[PDB]
Design a protein around this ligand. Sequence first.
Ligand SMILES: [Mg+2]
Ligand SMILES: [Mg+2]
Ligand SMILES: [Mg+2]
Ligand SMILES: [Mg+2]
Ligand SMILES: [Mg+2]
Ligand SMILES: [Mg+2]
Ligand SMILES: [Mg+2]
Ligand SMILES: [Mg+2]
Ligand SMILES: [Mg+2]
Ligand SMILES: [Mg+2]
Ligand SMILES: [Mg+2]
Ligand SMILES: [Mg+2]
Ligand SMILES: [Mg+2]
Ligand SMILES: [Zn+2]
Lengths: 116, 107, 23, 45, 136, 96, 122, 86, 97
Amino acid sequence: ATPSLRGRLARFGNPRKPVLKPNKPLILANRVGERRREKGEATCITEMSVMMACWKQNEFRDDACRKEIQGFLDCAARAQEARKMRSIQETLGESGSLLPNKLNKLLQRFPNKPYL
Amino acid sequence: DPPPSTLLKDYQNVPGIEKVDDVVKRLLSLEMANKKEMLKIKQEQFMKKIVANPEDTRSLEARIIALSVKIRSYEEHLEKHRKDKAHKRYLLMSIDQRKKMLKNLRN
Amino acid sequence: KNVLKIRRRKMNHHKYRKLVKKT
Amino acid sequence: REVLQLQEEVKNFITRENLEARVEAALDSRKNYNWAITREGLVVR
Amino acid sequence: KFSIYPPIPGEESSLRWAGKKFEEIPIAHIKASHNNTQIQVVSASNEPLAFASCGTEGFRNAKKGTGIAAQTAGIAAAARAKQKGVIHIRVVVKGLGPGRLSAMHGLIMGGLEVISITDNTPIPHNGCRPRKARKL
Amino acid sequence: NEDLPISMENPYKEPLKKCILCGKHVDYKNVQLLSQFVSPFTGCIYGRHITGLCGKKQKEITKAIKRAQIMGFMPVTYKDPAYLKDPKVCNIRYRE
Amino acid sequence: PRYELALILKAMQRPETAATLKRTIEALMDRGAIVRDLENLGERALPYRISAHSQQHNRGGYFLVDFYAPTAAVESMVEHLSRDIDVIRGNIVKHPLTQELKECEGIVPVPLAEKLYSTKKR
Amino acid sequence: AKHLKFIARTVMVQEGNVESAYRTLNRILTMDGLIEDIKHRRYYEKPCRRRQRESYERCRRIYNMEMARKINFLMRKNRADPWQGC
Amino acid sequence: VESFASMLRHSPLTQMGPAKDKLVIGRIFHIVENDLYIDFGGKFHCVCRRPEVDGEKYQKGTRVRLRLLDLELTSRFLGATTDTTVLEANAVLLGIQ
RNA sequence: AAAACUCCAGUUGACACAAAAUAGACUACGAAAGUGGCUUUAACAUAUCUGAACACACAAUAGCUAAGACCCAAACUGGGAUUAGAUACCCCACUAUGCUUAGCCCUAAACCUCAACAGUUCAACAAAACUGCUCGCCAGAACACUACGAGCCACAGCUUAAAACUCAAA
Ligand SMILES: [Mg+2]
Ligand SMILES: [Mg+2]
Ligand SMILES: [Mg+2]
Ligand SMILES: [Mg+2]
Ligand SMILES: [Mg+2]
Ligand SMILES: [Mg+2]
Ligand SMILES: [Mg+2]
Ligand SMILES: [Mg+2]
Ligand SMILES: [Mg+2]
Ligand SMILES: [Mg+2]
Ligand SMILES: [Mg+2]
Ligand SMILES: [Mg+2]
Ligand SMILES: [Mg+2]
Ligand SMILES: [Zn+2]
């Protein structure tokens, strides 16, 4: 249930102070905003931290801690193919709903009618 | 000032008044009530005192009595709360309205 | 509307207040 | 009806002579004001 | 079966952690400011057991308010708690800084078992007036 | 002319919807109902979009909740754990 | 007007609780009230630690005094309750059963507001 | 400070999914609007700016619920082409 | 001769009342993949997903039963002066015959 | 980053003359300013309408006078950064002030820039176009929220408010 718009705007005949002051007219556009891009991630920090603790505790020797060096390398790899898969998934389809351009095609088929 | 033991305006026509308990008389009296009921009693006492028919409440005289008792109430309110500007404005506008209808009734 | 007339008056008032302070 | 209904209720008022017995009776008794509402307009006590 | 609601104190509760009830598990307080993260581990009767922070663990000025710094501080606090004999822990976090979940992960990697998460962030009901806006 | 339509008030008219408390008396001492309309974790009073209450009932619920909290009948910061078992009525889904 | 006094009292024994209730009621009748009823919601834990009269209280006994008082006695009753040291919290309010319930037809449906903007091209 | 200590804003971890419990708690605070209250109370929002922001949020809410209603109303017509060759 | 008002009175579309929760038989007249286009009479047709159970006796000309949630499916939106119609009614397919 | 603090920081317990999360997706009250923690008291003019810039009553914030309060914020100022300079933006500390009582001051982009009452269905942008009646106000720009005169608990003030010279536009 949307909030009402009965006496919310400064119009003629309204005995109240305006509730809302829109800078844009409250009319549905025939467009949908584009899909916003994801932000910075800075992955692999935990595995880098544990490798990096091992280094400080063992005077930087792989032949001591191959195991979490390998863990960091795997996490870096898995992050890179995860980036690839999320890029391909976003080019393929949006999760749940549809893409903004197909939604735009629907809205061009059914335009808003703010006039007569 | 009506006495605090005066009975309410809406309650002063019931047949059983002198036989009920004194706690009931106190309960329906004006001490255990508010200033709007006190003003109703004062206004109807004035109506019985001054006008021909106290069952009109649609004439110039009745309206002047109503604004006069409201003016009295505003004066008491300001005497306690000197700094009430809203009720000071209401008192001044009531004085002007009473003067207007006084002029109309005189003319 | 732009604020060019507001700007004219703003500088007028600023210079007037500076003059009064100076004298 | 208002005056008559008010008349019989005065018989159960607290006075100076009913004070200690009424206080003890109140201490023995207990009233619960809590009740709940359902999704339907129904009261669960 | 499971309830995310914590057990009420003065009632029967079958939930146990090494025989101990919910009400006497030690508590780790993580104040996560915008420039630092401070972890203090206390018992239920308020005996301090472990205290570590980013400045304690070596980061000096602006590297303090990072995830890795809070992880390091949480690891060290969990190490001191393990020396003092702490296994299970209840986390209470205060603040919205960068190292909140990082400090929780630091406790976990240090080797403590978190059983309940509480957010005690101070939100006034319009008390003191905060600083003026930055013209940034 | 006998088959022309005629003017009447609308039949097939469903009766107007009524809130759950509509016709009920909200009292500040009824901290089981007030706890129902208070949020379980942070003690926040819910809005119309969550409670599904009409405007007058939402106003009475708000005033009674604030009154009970300042008179020492209700906790402010949390719902009573003793009343965290009542019939849920508020259209809010925290868990997943 | 008819008032209701919500009274959170100290967690005490029966004679002390009876003595405190007696003191409060006779105070009310000396200030000029006629008392309708005494109700016992009972002893229970407080929602929060109420600190009153240099004591920290965790539990309390909840009582109601439904009564009828003249207009200018509520202030005196509040001052007496403030000076009493067995009252954790006393509050005098107008009566919910004296305020009357209005009958409701139901929630009225509100439509979508129309003619907010002109029908020009824009 | 005067309330019971370990009831408000407390979630319990189930088999050790502490990350899932933290997500749940963050979801509690986001749905009750506590997080945005904290972000907006880090610095003082002057009352005129508070009123501008609340009016803007309310207009944005009105537009977004209308837009979502239109989208959900037209997704049923978003089918395959019924009469392909025109 | 019979007047149009009499026609409208002794028309089934008027004797039906509101369309909501009224069981109405209809015919399938067009199919696209698994989107069956059913007529139920009245002005518009409805579109129903093919039920996967017994999904092969749903062909062109099949008699089905419908619940008819709506008759036209229109709605007015935020800036509009008239409402947005979809030229299609709403119904739920319950079965055959 | 530096400066600053280390009589510092974290947990717990006592604790306000300050400010009033959520409710608030509500659209209310008031003449306007304004009003959103709880309780109680008093209380929200006019049974035609318009109408005082020769009056009377109010009027955000800032400010003045005197006496208090002091968590926090903060003009000014000091210190640290920045810069060619930085009397700024950025960080820290602190005062006038914001609060209360009493008295002034009487101003706002005091603007919903859209007068009151009654009623009806196109210049351009904005918030569709109008009718009857009344009051207030306006008549090229700049000089000019100025000069002078007058009034005012105002004395670096407020209200009212020109002209000369200039331009052929604004
Ligand atoms: Mg604009
Ligand atoms: Mg230094
Ligand atoms: Mg007039
Ligand atoms: Mg005037
Ligand atoms: Mg300060
Ligand atoms: Mg100071
Ligand atoms: Mg104050
Ligand atoms: Mg002023
Ligand atoms: Mg304003
Ligand atoms: Mg104007
Ligand atoms: Mg006028
Ligand atoms: Mg000026
Ligand atoms: Mg001047
Ligand atoms: Zn209702």
